[PDB]
Design a binder for these strands. Structure first.
Lengths: 461, 533, 146, 182, 73
RNA sequence: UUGAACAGAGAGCAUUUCCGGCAGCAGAGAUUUCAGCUGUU
């Protein structure tokens, strides 16, 4: 006969010291954790309700803003605090974003400014300090491109020359500007694409596919010798400046307002296009738009890729800013306020969270890329909670209640009505094309990723 | 990475040329099986062992020992939890332990209600209600507890402060609680079931059992469903959404006397006043095996959390081991003919002298079962009752007050809505039943719309013509008679014409069968005047 | 939590150990009971160097036991299996957490340094360098440690 | 149970473990407290009588105005209630509809009548006295504390003779007259 | 005979259940294969719990991010 | 932008080196352990 029941040790469970924290035992058994699916579901619902609780993206503005309305913004690729806003009255401003204030304000020209770039001039003469002064390239309207110096108080290794390192003249009004960042070659866009280098006051070379005015251009961030430039006859053109030969051209259906590359893939690019849409192209086969972002109401104005290679920010001529993932093709987030009208530029900051946004009003408002991730650093347990909830939500995505809650957002009134009007139009168009496919013999299925291309100049097999 | 626990650990369930999907599936299979094996590795960390009583002789049995020898033989802590009250003044007593195993709630039949810690002997609340109090339970903590009454059901505070007269639970007779939905379930002597949310204080639903007075009630925890035993001989499983019963079962003749359910959600024990007992497989609904001749109607039976069965039939109390296994040897039996080992002897017996067991319940996380009878309370020591090694995220049997209020707020924020209670606990995750098995697309939906708009030409709706099968069971004629006589439709014109066609072809086949003009007899006059029709 | 993670990492060596013949299941579970008590008292607040020392002494004892046990029970002085240096680097990791939660006590520092000098077969010359760097940057005004 | 913080409150708006929608302000308890009565069943039975009176007044309203049936019956009911003691002013049949309260009936009860006539000192003490058996209604005494009393017995409620209460009273006035052994 | 199942459809469960097989899958068998394992701490071990909760994109928080440079070397 | 060496950190990559299994020798710590020597697997 062996008799032994359960013995419990109080010193095994409730410990000795009056400070030592209480011990926690476990047992992972499905006979002792009953409602697995329902518990995870209600946890997901609580998660998305808390996200709507903390949905507060807007975080502030810049100093007093300009006097006319922002038409260009450039982010310092070297630092994180620094940007430059080109207004429309004719004043450029260099901004510190640590305390949200103006460094400096220059009356650059008399007409508008057209474009900015912030950079590091590799003079053959001497190397300017890349910790003491940062150097802007400002392209005007009155036939001027100037290189400017700014004293930045990042460091204090030390403790003159407040403006106008040099000027550059031309014939036409330039429209766009940027810099091939190796040995500081820079492209300007006016009548024809003129490639300049710093010390020579003259264009090193010139290209143009046709005789059209050219309005915007951009070098790719990696494989850094390739130029992409749009064209007012609804065109995209590619150039390989190591060859100085214009590489390829395609003609679209509407003028492409802006363009940018993704710095995580380096041979794809997004084109913000006037028919209310955004397009995603690869560098090899321009025949297929790799994707189409399709959630606006009027002219888009600008896009930018993400440093994380996943987010695309766009700002419409409508009073709104949209944000998309690279995958889904319908806008995840939408920001807006009554205090801003016709956003003209939006850019990412170099740490994948903060969005600079220059609208037409003259303020510059910045936003969070996630409505939930408070910038504050967080303890371990809380970090685990937030991540566990996010993966749980991403799992339980397509249940209908979670779908309704997370998709439910607020948009302004005129825009809601205009979306429903466009929806009514699309339903009628569906009916008409269905009747046409009934009646005629063979009309080929023309996919939505190619319903917007009229033709390339170089073709394939 | 094969182990012995995978059989219990594994969560049961029901190929493309797409590379991303293939990689996703191989990824999820790899990490799923790694996780299951890791939990089977967490198996080692459990602190204690089960309790066991083993004979070591064949001359000695198991049941012949009693509480005297066991109290002498096992430790001072267990012998001190071997409670023995004496409440001779008020009527027979009924018992409910709280879920934490730490607060005893007793109710006499006359007015006595007491709520005690019982372990370090604190006494929270005592109330001498005069009206006949019928049943009682803690609801969510040791802070809120409900008793029934003669007529109206009352909710009392921890101290004895009266808090609620829940009007609409008329003549309540058996209470219980669902702790993961804050649900008070009351079975009345009205035949009505009433589910009440104690959180917002709102009756979630009623349910109408057309049998009669609710005889007995118990809940399946792993499904959170309510089991009622009526008077007709039926036991019926219900859920608070639909007004029809989920399932009915004819388990006893005469009236049902008691129901009880194992925590594993896979075994039910019912006992009926026709001196009978049934051991039921819940899922698939096959009454597994049945004892037919007990020498008393069983009052109350209850399940262990380790697989003991407790039977209470008047002045006796018996406990059986390993009873719920399926094989035809584990039949519970009062005696083994000539030491027949395949039969199942009683595991531990006891009598009471002059009482009658009013009911009984296991303690949660010790190994004792508490008996409530006509004048006193007793807590019998049993070796293998409770799982010694608990889990501390749901039920912490050692609970500081701060930890209490934290667990309580967390469960309020973590409640389930009352509508997710069904017969299968993965259905809230799974797909719709009616919708398609394979995911179709825009092209597929355009195709099926085109097919349903071509069906008017290709006759897709009405069953087609075969002269082979007999005209009684002929699908066209059964369709025609299933349709009424008074309205005539274009579909009906179509089915009339094709039934004429089936008659024609079947009569030609009858002529070729019986032996009239056959072997490709061609009617070329019909050929020649088909020109204009 | 953190206790759970450390025990989880502690499993597979014990798994291999009872998988080989030299340990049985009850010995295993008792050892893990002692381990839980130590690691939980280490990760609550209120612990100290005396707690650390008691844990390290316990693990050194179980290493001696496993040595004599395997030696007797299968005559293999050193088996090609995870267990050995697993126990050893568990000890070294305990030393590491000990200095990080208390960098103050030179006695405990010295026990760590003497253990690392003693097991000089499998040390890293670079790891003794790392320890001396740690000690000098924390105490530079200890000419004796110099 | 926590004074739980901001976000968890705005998630758990509608929860309340103390006051529910159905126990409407704990009205029964509050009136029970003000008049020191003993059973929840007493309150709810008074509720039922009040409810039946109000359904009578409602159907009497739904009858057409100038019926002598209606006039004579409503006036007779007003006689019955004014002699009963529940409602005060006999003229407003609106106050038949709107003044009839369980508070009014429970104040027509016995111990409130003691506090009315300033027999006892406060109402709980009056309940102690009626339970202890010192107070009689006319020729016999009362032990059931929940006696209803109309006006015509409010006229005759008094303390019992040769009680130590009446002894103390007439002793303070210096008028105990122990031939009656009062 | 002596078993009677209800066939009616619980409409609130019909709300709580899915729509169809959603786009990123192909078959409801796949859909249940994904929704097989609960991810909670109270169902798997802590190591696998972190291993399943480690998200795809991760950054260090307060540092300048750089476009990737080709390592041809 | 390259060519050499100089001084290395140890925070990367491959062992394709040999060792972490033994009989005999002596040195060392307070009985027991760290490295070499010869042959061996």
């Amino acid at each position: 006969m062996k008799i032994k029941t359960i013995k419990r040790s109080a010193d095994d469970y409730v410990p000795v010291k009056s400070t030592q924290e209480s011990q926690m035992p476990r047992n992972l058994n499905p006979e002792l954790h009953p409602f697995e699916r329902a518990r995870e579901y209600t946890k997901a619902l609580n998660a998305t309700k808390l996200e709507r609780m903390f949905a507060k993206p807007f975080v502030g503005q810049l100093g007093y803003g300009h006097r006319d309305g922002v038409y260009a913004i450039a982010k310092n690729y070297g630092s994180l605090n620094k940007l430059a806003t080109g207004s429309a009255d004719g004043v450029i401003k260099y901004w510190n974003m640590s305390t949200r204030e103006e460094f400096v304000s220059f009356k650059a020209h008399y007409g508008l400014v057209t474009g900015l770039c912030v950079t590091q001039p590799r003079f053959h003469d001497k190397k300017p300090d890349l910790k003491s002064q940062n150097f802007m390239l400002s392209c005007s309207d009155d036939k001027t491109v100037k290189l400017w110096s700014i004293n930045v108080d990042d460091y204090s290794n030390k403790n003159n020359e407040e403006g106008l390192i040099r000027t550059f003249d031309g014939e036409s009004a330039f429209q766009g500007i940027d810099s091939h960042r190796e040995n500081s070659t820079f492209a300007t866009g006016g009548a024809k694409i003129h490639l300049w280098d710093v010390n020579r006051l003259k264009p090193v070379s010139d290209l143009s596919w046709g005789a059209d005015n050219i309005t915007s251009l951009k070098f790719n961030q990696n494989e850094t010798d390739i130029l992409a430039s749009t064209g007012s006859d609804n065109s995209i053109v590619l150039y390989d400046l190591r060859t100085n030969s214009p590489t390829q051209k395609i003609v679209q259906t509407m003028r492409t307002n802006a363009i940018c590359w993704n710095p995580m893939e380096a041979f794809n690019f997004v084109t913000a296009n006037e028919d209310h849409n955004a397009y995603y192209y690869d560098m090899r086969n321009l025949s297929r738009s790799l994707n189409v972002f399709k959630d606006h109401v009027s002219a888009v104005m600008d896009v930018d890729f993400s440093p994380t290679g996943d987010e695309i920010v766009t700002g419409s001529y409508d009073k709104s800013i949209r944000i998309y993932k690279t995958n889904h093709g319908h806008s995840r987030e939408i920001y807006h306020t009554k205090r801003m009208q016709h956003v003209f530029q939006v850019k990412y900051s170099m740490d994948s969270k903060y969005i600079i946004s220059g609208s037409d009003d003259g303020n510059v408002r910045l936003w969070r890329s996630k409505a939930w991730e408070r910038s504050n650093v967080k303890t371990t347990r809380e970090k685990n909670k937030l991540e566990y909830d996010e993966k749980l939500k991403e799992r339980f995505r397509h249940m209908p209640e979670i779908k309704r809650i997370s998709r439910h957002r607020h948009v302004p009134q005129v825009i809601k009505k205009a979306q429903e009007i466009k929806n009514i139009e699309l339903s009628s168009i569906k009916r008409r094309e269905a009747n046409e496919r009934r009646t005629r013999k063979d009309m080929p299925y023309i996919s939505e990723r190619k319903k917007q291309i009229v033709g390339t100049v170089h073709k394939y097999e | 990475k094969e182990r012995e626990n995978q059989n219990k650990f594994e969560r049961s369930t029901y190929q493309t040329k797409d590379k991303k999907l293939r990689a996703g599936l191989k990824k999820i299979d790899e990490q799923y099986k790694k996780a299951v094996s890791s939990a089977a590795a967490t198996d080692y960390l459990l602190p204690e062992s089960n309790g066991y009583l083993e004979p070591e002789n064949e001359l000695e049995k198991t049941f012949k020992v009693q509480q005297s020898e066991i109290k002498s033989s096992v430790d001072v802590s267990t012998a001190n939890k071997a409670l023995d009250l004496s409440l001779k003044e008020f009527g027979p007593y009924h018992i409910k332990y709280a879920k934490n195993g730490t607060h005893l709630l007793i109710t006499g039949r006359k007015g006595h209600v007491a709520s005690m810690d019982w372990r370090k002997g604190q006494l929270r609340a005592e109330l001498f209600l005069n009206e006949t109090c019928h049943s009682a339970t803690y609801l969510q903590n040791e802070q809120y507890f409900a008793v029934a009454q003669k007529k109206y059901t009352f909710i009392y505070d921890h101290e004895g402060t009266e808090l609620h007269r829940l009007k609409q639970h008329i003549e309540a007779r058996h209470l219980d609680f669902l702790p993961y939905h804050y649900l008070l379930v009351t079975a009345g002597e009205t035949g009505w079931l009433k589910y009440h949310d104690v959180s917002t204080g709102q009756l979630v639903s009623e349910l109408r059992t057309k049998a009669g007075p609710t005889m007995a009630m118990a809940q399946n925890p792993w499904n959170a469903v309510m089991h009622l035993g009526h008077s007709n001989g039926t036991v019926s499983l219900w859920s608070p959404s639909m007004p029809e019963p989920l399932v009915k079962l004819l388990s006893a003749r005469g009236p049902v006397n008691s129901i009880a359910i194992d925590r594993s959600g896979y075994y039910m024990a019912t006992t009926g006043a026709d001196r009978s007992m049934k051991i039921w497989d819940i899922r698939n609904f096959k009454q597994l095996h049945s004892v037919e001749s007990l020498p008393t109607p069983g009052t109350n039976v209850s399940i262990s959390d380790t697989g003991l069965l407790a039977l209470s039939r008047g002045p006796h109390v018996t406990l059986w081991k390993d009873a719920l296994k399926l094989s035809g040897d584990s039949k519970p039996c009062f005696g083994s003919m000539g030491g027949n080992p395949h039969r199942n002897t009683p595991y531990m017996s006891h009598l009471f002298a002059g009482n009658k067991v009013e009911n009984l319940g296991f303690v949660p996380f010790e190994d004792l079962l508490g008996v409530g009878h006509q004048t006193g309370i007793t807590n019998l020591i049993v070796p293998g009752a409770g799982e010694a090694n608990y889990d501390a995220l749901e039920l912490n049997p050692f609970e500081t007050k701060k930890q209490r209020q934290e667990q309580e707020v967390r469960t309020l924020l973590n409640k389930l809505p009352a509508d997710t209670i069904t017969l299968d606990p993965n259905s809230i995750g799974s797909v719709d039943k009616r919708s398609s098995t394979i995911r179709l697309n825009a092209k597929d939906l355009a195709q099926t719309t085109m097919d349903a708009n071509n069906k008017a030409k290709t006759n897709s709706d009405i069953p087609d013509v075969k002269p082979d099968v007999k005209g009684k069971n002929s699908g066209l004629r059964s369709f025609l008679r299933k349709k009424t006589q008074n309205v005539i439709d274009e579909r009906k014109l179509r089915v009339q014409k094709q039934l004429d066609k089936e008659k024609n072809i079947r009569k030609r086949n009858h002529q070729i069968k019986q032996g009239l003009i056959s072997e490709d007899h061609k009617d070329v006059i019909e050929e020649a005047l088909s020109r204009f029709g | 939590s953190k206790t759970r993670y450390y025990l989880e990492q502690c499993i597979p060596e014990m798994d291999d150990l009872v998988e080989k013949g030299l340990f049985t299941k009850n010995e295993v579970s008792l050892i893990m009971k002692k381990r839980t008590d130590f690691e939980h008292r280490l990760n609550s607040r209120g612990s100290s160097i005396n707690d650390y020392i008691k844990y390290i002494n316990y693990e050194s004892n179980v290493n001696k036991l496993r040595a004599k046990r395997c030696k007797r029970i299968l005559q293999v002085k050193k088996t090609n299996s995870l267990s050995d240096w697993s126990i050893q680097q568990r000890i070294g990791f305990i030393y590491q957490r000990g200095t990080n939660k208390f960098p103050q006590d030179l006695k405990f520092w010295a026990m760590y340094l003497n253990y690392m000098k003693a097991r000089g077969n499998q040390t890293s010359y670079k790891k003794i360098h790392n320890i001396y760097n740690q000690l000098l940057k924390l105490h530079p005004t200890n000419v004796d440690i110099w | 149970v926590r004074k739980l913080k901001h976000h968890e409150q705005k998630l758990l708006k509608k929860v309340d473990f103390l006051e529910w929608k159905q126990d409407q302000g704990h009205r029964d308890t509050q009136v029970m407290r003000t008049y020191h009565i003993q059973n929840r069943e007493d309150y709810h039975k008074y509720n039922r009588i009040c409810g039946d009176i109000r359904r009578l007044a409602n159907k009497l309203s739904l009858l057409p105005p100038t019926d002598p049936f209606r006039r004579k019956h409503e006036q007779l009911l007003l006689d019955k209630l004014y002699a009963m003691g529940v409602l005060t002013t006999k003229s407003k049949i609106s106050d038949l509809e709107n003044k009839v309260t369980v508070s009014a009936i429970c104040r027509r009860r016995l111990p409130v009548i003691m506090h009315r006539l300033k027999m006892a000192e406060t109402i709980q003490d009056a309940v102690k006295f009626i339970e202890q058996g010192h107070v009689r209604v006319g020729p016999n005494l009362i032990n059931d504390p929940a006696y209803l009393v109309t006006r015509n017995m409010e006229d005759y409620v008094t303390w019992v003779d040769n009680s130590k209460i009446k002894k103390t009273l007439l002793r303070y006035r210096n008028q105990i007259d122990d031939f009656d052994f009062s | 005979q002596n078993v009677i199942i209800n066939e009616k459809v619980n409409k609130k469960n019909l709300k709580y259940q899915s729509s169809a097989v959603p786009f990123p899958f192909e078959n409801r068998e796949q859909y249940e294969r994904s929704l097989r394992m609960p991810i909670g701490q109270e169902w798997t071990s802590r190591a696998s719990h972190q291993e399943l909760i480690k998200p795809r994109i991760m950054t260090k928080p307060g540092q300048v991010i750089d476009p990737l440079k080709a390592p041809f070397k």
